[PDB]
Amino acid sequence: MIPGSFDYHRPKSIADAVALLTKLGEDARPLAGGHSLIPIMKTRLATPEHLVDLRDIGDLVGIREEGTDVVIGAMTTQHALIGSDFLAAKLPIIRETSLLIADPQIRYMGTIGGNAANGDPGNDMPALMQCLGAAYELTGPEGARIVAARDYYQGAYFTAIEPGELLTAIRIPVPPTGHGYAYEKLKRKIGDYATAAAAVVLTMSGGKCVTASIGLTNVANTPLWAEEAGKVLVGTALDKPALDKAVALAEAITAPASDGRGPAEYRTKMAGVMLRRAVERAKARA
Amino acid sequence: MIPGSFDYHRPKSIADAVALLTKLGEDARPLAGGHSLIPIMKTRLATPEHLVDLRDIGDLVGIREEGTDVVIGAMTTQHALIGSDFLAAKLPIIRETSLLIADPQIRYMGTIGGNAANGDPGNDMPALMQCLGAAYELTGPEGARIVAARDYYQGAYFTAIEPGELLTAIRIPVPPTGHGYAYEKLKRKIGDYATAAAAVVLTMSGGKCVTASIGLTNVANTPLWAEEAGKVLVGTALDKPALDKAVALAEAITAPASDGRGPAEYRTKMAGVMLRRAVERAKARAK
Amino acid sequence: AEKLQGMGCKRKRVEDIRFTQGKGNYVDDVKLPGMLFGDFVRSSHAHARIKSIDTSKAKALPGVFAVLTAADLKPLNLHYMPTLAGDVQAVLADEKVLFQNQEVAFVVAKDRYVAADAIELVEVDYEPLPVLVDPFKAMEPDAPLLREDIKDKMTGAHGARKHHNHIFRWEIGDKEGTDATFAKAEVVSKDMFTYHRVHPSPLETCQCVASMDKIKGELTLWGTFQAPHVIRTVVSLISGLPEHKIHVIAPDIGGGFGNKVGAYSGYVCAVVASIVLGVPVKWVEDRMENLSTTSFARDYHMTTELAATKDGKILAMRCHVLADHGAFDACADPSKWPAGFMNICTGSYDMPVAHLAVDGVYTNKASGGVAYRCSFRVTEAVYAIERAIETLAQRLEMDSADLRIKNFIQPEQFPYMAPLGWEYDSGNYPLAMKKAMDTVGYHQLRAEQKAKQEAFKRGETREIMGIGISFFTEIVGAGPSKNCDILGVSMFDSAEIRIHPTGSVIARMGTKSQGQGHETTYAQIIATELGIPADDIMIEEGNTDTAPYGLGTYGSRSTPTAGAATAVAARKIKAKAQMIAAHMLEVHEGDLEWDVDRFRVKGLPEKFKTMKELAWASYNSPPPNLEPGLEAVNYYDPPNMTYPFGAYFCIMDIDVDTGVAKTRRFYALDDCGTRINPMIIEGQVHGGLTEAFAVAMGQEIRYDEQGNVLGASFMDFFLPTAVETPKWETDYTVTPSPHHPIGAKGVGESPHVGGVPCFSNAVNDAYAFLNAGHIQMPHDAWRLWKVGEQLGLHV
Amino acid sequence: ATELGIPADDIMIEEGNTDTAPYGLGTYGSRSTPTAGAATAVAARKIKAKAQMIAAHMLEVHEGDLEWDVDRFRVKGLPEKFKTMKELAWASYNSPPPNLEPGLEAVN
Amino acid sequence: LETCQCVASMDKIKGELTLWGTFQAPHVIRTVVSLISGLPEHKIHVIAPDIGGG
Amino acid sequence: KAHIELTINGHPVEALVEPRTLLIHFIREQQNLTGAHIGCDTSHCGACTVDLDGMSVKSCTMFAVQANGASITTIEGMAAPDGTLSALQEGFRMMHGLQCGYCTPGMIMRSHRLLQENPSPTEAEIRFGIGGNLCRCTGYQNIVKAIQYAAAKINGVP
Amino acid sequence: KAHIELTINGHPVEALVEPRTLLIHFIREQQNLTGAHIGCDTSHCGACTVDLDGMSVKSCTMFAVQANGASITTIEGMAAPDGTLSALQEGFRMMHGLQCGYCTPGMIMRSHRLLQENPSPTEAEIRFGIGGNLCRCTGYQNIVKAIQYAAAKINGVPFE
Ligand SMILES: Cc1cc2nc3c(=O)[nH]c(=O)nc-3n(C[C@H](O)[C@H](O)[C@H](O)COP(=O)(O)OP(=O)(O)OC[C@H]3O[C@@H](n4cnc5c(N)ncnc54)[C@H](O)[C@@H]3O)c2cc1C
Ligand SMILES: Cc1cc2nc3c(=O)[nH]c(=O)nc-3n(C[C@H](O)[C@H](O)[C@H](O)COP(=O)(O)OP(=O)(O)OC[C@H]3O[C@@H](n4cnc5c(N)ncnc54)[C@H](O)[C@@H]3O)c2cc1C
Ligand SMILES: Nc1ccn([C@@H]2O[C@H](COP(=O)(O)OP(=O)(O)OC[C@H]3Oc4nc5nc(N)nc(O)c5nc4C(S)=C3S)[C@@H](O)[C@H]2O)c(=O)n1
Ligand code: FES
Ligand code: FES
Ligand code: FES
Ligand code: FES
User: What CA–CA distance (Å, rounded) separates C84 from C103?
Assistant: First the structure.
């Protein structure tokens, strides 16, 4: 319950926060909503010497459309994502997913950037951002760069970010008007990380699937983008034979943990059932 | 019980205390042992805006032999007076009187200068100082001066001190070796101010009184030096007819209050009884 | 009439005023001058010798005042403490650790933040020993010797002591008769039902504030105690302080659920530390330590058999249990009952003969067993019989409702001597079963279920429907002095009631609420007895200096014991009031009759004295034959237990492809005799059914092969939220207890006792048409997925 | 202590908290010994009478066969058969005679 | 040597008065305070602690 | 130690805190506002819920330094200045929405924000809307009643 | 407010006080050393007596600012660390030198100093020596006995 001692900073700008993180090095961590970091400080699994709170940086908060993308600041809270009627109109999967994350209190504090950056395979946003083909904007001492969500995760708490960088924004391509979408999660209770979950976006024309993308949550040590499973839906009527193929291809890439949610063979099969159910709801929406 | 608020000062020297009392005017009082001032602040009889505490001024405490006098600093405590071997040798009446003042706690704090300056006719030291013919050394913004104890007291809380002055020391001529002395106090209980008390110092040679001096406590709005009463003892054997004349001359200058200690007339008579008894003890001691 | 709020009223709770405003006073709210905070260095190992503890770095940390180890306690003979089960438990580990997270040292610091720092600086050197976690292996010849302090090596069952890991063997019932029945019965129905390890997990953890006043030589001990007087007596016996100088205070308690009966190491260490330091010491455990180091519940492996005729008459029951007690036997029970009241396991049925045997074993786990609304192992007894009824019914090809109805103990049979020794007080089972079946539309549910099964076989649905039945007989109110005691103190309880001159009342009882509403409901009993409004009555519990001695709140005993005492003490006051009335009215006491709130003169009803008038007269004009004042005490030794009962029905739908089960309907009929406060009873039922749902459908504490405790935090331990928790439909019948002064039985544990078999029976029943056999709890989604996987449902 | 044969040091006395102390009229008129001192003796004699009943039950004699010796009841003629007050206080909790309430207390 | 004194504490949340005081007859004081305050006796907790002479 | 200044239940607060001090401990220990409770060590239970700048926050999952500048309401702040209970406090009592009382501060503080988010919620909205708060005693059914009772009272005020 | 640093019962103390705060009130109200008592408003009773730089002082007749830099012992500071009572505290109990207890802290603190001033006092010296301390309960006779008992304990030989 009790964390180790640390020094606490409130930088006023992205530039200042990056300067601090760079100077302080490995012993400093950004502090966003604190609802993954503070819990692991309380267990002393994390014992940073410095916390760099991002609270006073207004440029990190916000939702805007820019070109063919929606750009969401890293400090935008889950509660704000749910509340955004502009996001609901453009990217309605985000509200659906966010309502499946944690509980009201946690959603008031937890941020989209923190959910993306944290590195726990339990987080729901990473696979959704892989499904949507989102890009993460990072700023550090050497300047800006972009890392695809699909390329950001290497393992539990291992990600493509470098020393002294902040994830400043998430850039999400806006799906076509009329697209289908779904996030389908299996969990033990409110607040629980998924036994398995699937994110789907797809478009249809003339009764046939034109595009499909699939993410899978918490059925490996990272989120997964189920590339082949999405591809096999394209050109089909999203009928039983097509879904059986997609389920096979998605199950094949899983490598779940065996924990209180059940053994790895169950979770693999649940990835497939979530996928089936998500594709069906997305089809109907399309 | 609760005094009004004030600012507190701790001057480091006499000169700094005097300057402060001069600057701040009558809203400032010197604080010595506090055992008359703090009780009247607590009843809001006194409401000074400043207290000038003399405690850090080491110069004000002491008992010194100088010339033919003993000089006692104003901040010297009753307890210190009692404990002085030197005073017990040269001025034994001081211990005797001090042991009739107040109580142990009060005597730890209360000072000779505060007893002498205070101006309450109930204080014991004033009339002892008049008996002894002491001189008070005062330092003010206008410099030093001396006022005889016999000239220092004009009324209840009305003394010869002027604005900005401190009483710094009491200068007491050392009486002859072998002198008699006594301080005889009538009081209702330990710590009570006298119904009446008498201080006596006298000398004898060959069955006859050579010198005598009498002070009377708390039987007028001031201490009293009973000048004529002492003079009429000189040349006599200090027997009952000699004392009758002294008593008459002492009683005649009293003007007591009527309070819980009894009516004025009773207190005048007790001044006479105390005088008789003090003279008898002093005669026995005289030596 | 408006003001009375007596028995039967849905009186709103007096506790709520302070609790809704944050003005309850729970242990961690206590702040005393100079108070320090203590907490433990705990074992990383399940089984190991302690070679060394280095505390020097911790002691040297600014703000640390003491670091206790067993070496400091041994001289005081406090390195072990006694348990309610007649074993001992290690306070601080001495030569070895025996469960993961066991206490090894106790750091005392300026506050909890410094204490936590200082715990991390203590270095323990361990020497690993082989871990024992499977109770089925505990009495094998090569099983590790756990309890070196009390046992020598004994590798079999035929030596002059039992096997070293065998705690006890307890048997009851007619072994020869039962074996003869099973040797010739037409049907023998046998299963091994495991009641998995779970935990009561009250929302407030265990905690105390010890304050030894060294100047006075008096100890004050605030704490989370369900039985504060018992704790006083135990602290006296072990510390050597006399009882009149030990002031135990159980203030408001944030739920207990059986977790707060016994003593824990933290209480002993806080007290020792306070005695050493002369200042108060607070100890508050965190959740992970609560779940992994304080009383677990259940952990019974029950080999359960029924003998029957083919037509469905039950002839006998034979049950043997393997009980996993963890490393120390700390199971709270009356002293003569090492398996509690597990011998209520013949349930609601009239059987001629039965036999029960229970073996307790040590393993490298936390201690406990009796906790979490068990009524002293009644949860296990009821699960055994109500599951066995269902598996028998399957084997007979009978409907299990019909099987129960063919076997129920009939109303005219009460008081009914059951074949394992308990004499049930009263019951009307056929009426309650009928009311329940009619309300849920039972025969129609069965036809609906049959059609859904046919649809499943045709490929038309992936859902299956189960109908769970639990018809149970509880036993609560421990208990008669002949056979019920806690460490030699007979299991009575008590009430003291004092009426003030102006007619208000202070009353205290020997129980202790942890949320059950006693402060409201005891006043309702008095209000009806005396005609004094309930709001004119103050109820207090839990301060051992002031309350009459009692045995505490557990085993749903408050209403049977202290509720009885309350009524009997009030009836003493009434009798004295009658004598005062007779004196005032100048009549014979026999000429008077009670009428609500006054005594009237028979056949001159104009002439009367009210209870308020009589209270004043007791002070103002006391009759010369009598003492002044108006008060009474009763210490109530019950003649028997009370035996409430219930009929619970669960309709459950299960998605075979995910394993996800969803309760459709849950109907709970409870009969606890006279109902003091229907609103409070209903809340007790809602809470107990939610626990039953949690235990049956998800909750567990597990150990791996290395002895690591698994799932002992809210990341994994299933506590339902408002989203998961079903809606509850409740109902009742009223069958008073004939021996109780107001006819009231206990009820608070009934919902859990009955509810777990109801849920588990529903799940088992859903899969019965597929021949799944007995499905072991919990029935979470992965486990139900495995059931279906193994039946070939997924291909 | 004299009434019950329990040392004075094993007895805690309290007064002045109206929630806990039995109702009384207070201390003035030098009344404490005449009134509450009387009540104290009478209440202690009620406990003694109950203790005598417990002793008779435990020793399997009549109450009239018992005699009090400072802090214990002995059987007349058989002084080796006795129960101390301390023993009887435990028995009142541990083995209450079937016609008596558990515990050992009184008010006057 | 100790003068007369008290500490009154009305708990407005609970509707209960606690009254510490220099009372030779605390139960009498309770019953008096009930009669003049209209609070019932079970809600008036009078406490006479150590008293420095009466 | 960091100097903070904030508002709690309408009153200014200033304090010096270690950055690691959790908000729940600053509230209970330094401020002596012991209504808010701790029920867990992993951020699940919600017993520590306070209303902070228009949000329901689990105060065991925030440091006191993060609350610098904030306006916080705890359960002690819910009754009106004349002592009258809030509609929620009254509804929890009327509907028997508590037993041991340990979750009750948190449940009421969450529910205070819930009924600002949605003044007229359905039962499914209530249950979901209190998903971050655990209760061991009640089985939630009467808590839903309590919230519905409070909504009706609030919706009648104007 | 004024800043003061002093020693009380052997422990360092640092505080802020108003100049007009009486020492008795600083001790009782700010330091929570509530053994010292107030029995009067005119400096007669001595119930407020503490030992201050080797003197017996009526702490109701001194401002806390005057005690800056002082060493004070109050009744709480008299018992040994091993729990054993001082000679005086034991003698007061043994000789029944207290009843209500209200004067006792100031009587013991004065007597602590008395016995340093005069370790073997006569009865008349004892009575005079506690003349600044009033008791209402005892009539003083058993107080004199208590102080004699303590002196004889300290001296290892009785006197009167
Ligand atoms: C009880 C509970 C249940 C939960 N349930 C779920 C759930 O169902 N699904 C789900 O997805 N989440 C769940 N969460 C996690 C929650 O969503 C967290 O808010 C999230 O994981 C982290 O976001 P945060 O803003 O709180 O980040 P923090 O906790 O502040 O930080 C998390 C990590 O990310 C780093 N970080 C944060 N922001 C940046 C940045 N901009 N650039 C670089 N590094 C950064 C931090 O340094 C830290 O290492 C749950 C949490 C709790 C306490
Ligand atoms: C209970 C009790 C009983 C007592 N009994 C007696 C008694 O029997 N006989 C008796 O004689 N006294 C008695 N006293 C009075 C006591 O002796 C006081 O100590 C004394 O009157 C004043 O001396 P102090 O040092 O305490 O002066 P303070 O109280 O500090 O000062 C008294 C007054 O003198 C002024 N002052 C002090 N020192 C100086 C100085 N150097 N120069 C100029 N002005 C100064 C102050 O400003 C104030 O106006 C009693 C006191 C008490 C509390
Ligand atoms: N015939 C009856 C029976 C009971 N009641 C009311 O119901 C309440 C529960 O009474 P009872 O059934 O006698 O049970 P106890 O009070 O002895 O409670 C113990 C029981 O309480 C249970 N319910 C709990 N509920 C809360 N909130 N907290 C716990 O710790 C609880 N622990 C569990 C466990 S475990 C146990 S053993 C009391 O207010 C009583 O007046 C009544 O109105 N009529
Ligand atoms: S204490 Fe459990 S969420 Fe805060
Ligand atoms: S009322 Fe007990 S935890 Fe909710
Ligand atoms: S209080 Fe009486 S002398 Fe100080
Ligand atoms: S003991 Fe009571 S005033 Fe002295």
Answer: 19
User: Would you give the end-to-end CA distance of chain F in angstroms?
Assistant: 46
Phi–psi pair at A70, nearest 5 degrees: -105, 130
Strand partners, A225: A215
Q: What is A129-140 written as a DSSP string? A: HHHTT-EEEEEE
Report the C-alpha gap between C439 and C729 in whole angstroms. Answer: 11
How far is the centre of ligand 5, averaged over its atoms, from the C-alpha of F137 (Å)? Answer: 5
Residue C112 CA to residue C318 CA, distance in Å, equals 52
**CATH of range G1-77; options 3.50.50.60, 3.40.50.1100, 3.90.1640.30, 3.10.20.30:** 3.10.20.30
Unique residue bearing structure tokens 């950037």: A113
Q: What would the DSSP string read from start to end of F6-72? A: EEETTEEEEEEE-TT-BHHHIIIIIS--TTS----SSS-S-TTEEEETTEEEEGGGSBGGGGTT-EE
Give C159's contacts (C-beta < 8 A, 6+ positions apart). none
Asked whether C314 and C308 are in contact (CB, 8 A), the reply is yes
Tokens of C110: 């300026």
G78-159 CATH: 1.10.150.120
C558 at F interface, C-beta within 8 A = no
Q: What share of chain E is helix, strand, coil (3-state, %, to 5)?
A: 30, 30, 45
Which residues of C are known to be catalytic? 226, 373-374, 749
* DSSP codes, G121-135: --HHHHHHHTTT---
Which of C266, C295, C324 corresponds to the end of one domain?
C295
Rounded distance between C-alpha atoms, residue D50 and residue D39, angstroms: 17
G6 is known to lie in a ligand binding site: no
The answer to whether domain F78-158 has CATH 1.10.150.120 is yes
Domain count, chain B: 3
For the record, the structure tokens of D34 come out as 């005449």
Report the C-alpha gap between G65 and G68 in whole angstroms.
5
* Residue type present at position B141: P
Mark C533-542 as b/e (b = at least 16 C-beta within 10 Å). bbbbbbbbbb
Taking the alpha carbons at both ends of chain E, their separation in whole angstroms is 8
**Which method was it determined by?**
X-ray
Q: What are phi and psi of C681, to 5 degrees?
A: -60, -45
Go through A64-98 and write b for each residue having 16 or more CB atoms within 10 A of its CB, e for each that does not. eeeeebbbbbbbbbbbbbbebeebeebbbbbbbbb
Domains of chain G, by residue range, sit at 1-77, 78-159
Ligand nearest to the CA of F23: 4
CB proximity list for G100: less than 8 A, separation 6 or greater: E1, E2, E50, E51, E52, E53, G136, G137
Q: Are strands C207-213 and B196-205 parallel, antiparallel or unpaired?
A: unpaired
Instruction: Supply angle C-alpha C67, C71, C72, rounded to 5.
Output: 55
The amino acid that residue C430 corresponds to is P
Question: CA separation (Å) from C154 to A228, A281, C151, C363, C661?
Answer: 62, 64, 8, 15, 46
User: What is the domain range of residue D107?
Assistant: 1-108
CA distance linking residue C601 with residue C578, whole number of Å: 11
Last residue of a domain, which of B11, B30, B54?
A: B54
Q: Name which of B161, B142, B122, B198 is nearest B26 in CA terms.
A: B161
Cβ of F96 closer than 6 Å to ligand 5, yes or no, is no
Angle at G116 between CA G112 and CA G118, to 5 degrees: 115
A191 is an annotated ligand-binding site residue: no
**Residue D59 — φ and ψ, nearest 5°?**
-90, -5
User: How far, in Å, is the centroid of ligand 1 from the Cα of A114?
Assistant: 5
Query: By the CB < 8 Å criterion, does C634 face chain D?
Result: yes
DSSP class of residue D22?
P
Burial (0-12, 13-18, 19+ Cβ within 10 Å), A113:
buried
